[PDB]
Amino acid sequence: MNTHPPQLMEATSAKIVMLGESGAGKSSIALRFTRNEFLANQETTIGAAFLSKTVMIDGRALKYEIWDTAGLERFRSLAPIYYRGASGALVVYDITNSESLKKAQTWIKELRANADPSLIIVLVGNKKDLGSLRQVSFEDGQRLAAEEQLAAFYEASAKDNNNVEQVFLDLAAKL
Numbered sequence: 454m455n456t457h458p459p460q461l462m463e464a465t466s467a468k469i470v471m472l473g474e475s476g477a478g479k480s481s482i483a484l485r486f487t488r489n490e491f492l493a494n495q496e497t498t499i500g501a502a503f504l505s506k507t508v509m510i511d512g513r514a515l516k517y518e519i520w521d522t523a524g525l526e527r528f529r530s531l532a533p534i535y536y537r538g539a540s541g542a543l544v545v546y547d548i549t550n551s552e553s554l555k556k557a558q559t560w561i562k563e564l565r566a567n568a569d570p571s572l573i574i575v576l577v578g579n580k581k582d583l584g585s586l587r588q589v590s591f592e593d594g595q596r597l598a599a600e601e602q603l604a605a606f607y608e609a610s611a612k613d614n615n616n617v618e619q620v621f622l623d624l625a626a627k628l
């Protein structure tokens with residue numbers, strides 16, 4: 454009766470948790486990858502927006518767990534538990550709102566010191582339309598990403614699809 458069944462099979466899941474700052478299109482960008490639709494009057498969630506869907510890459514069926522946490526709440530129970538096995542992390546920051554970048558650097562400091570060093574973090578900017586009135590240089594923002602070995606840093610806009618397909622395809626391509 455002593456046989457041995459192989460455990461290595463298909464049906465995988467990638468858990469990516471995305472934080473940022475409230476009002477910085479945090480929940481807005483998440484909606485653009487979940488159902489790929491935009492809600493103009495979409496408020497930043499105070500609880501948790503969690504949708505998990507299966508995609509088929511090269512015949513491989515894997516479901517992505519994307520956790521849209523509260524826009525800016527550090528006192529919630531989500532603070533410690535959000536990275537309970539996060540394969541990757543994402544954080545949204547607006548290029549004219551310096552606060553979002555200041556909040557972003559806050560999250561990235563704690564999460565890397567609490568979770569995993571090789572955890573890939575996606576630095577994504579908000580509203581590429583701010584090309585002229587951008588207070589902080591995106592070029593400078595991506596520098597701190599590359600400096601800390603962040604493989605993913607891109608610009609996103611809710612009405613521009615955010616290139617959310619590309620940023621995830623990039624990640625899925627390497628992993």
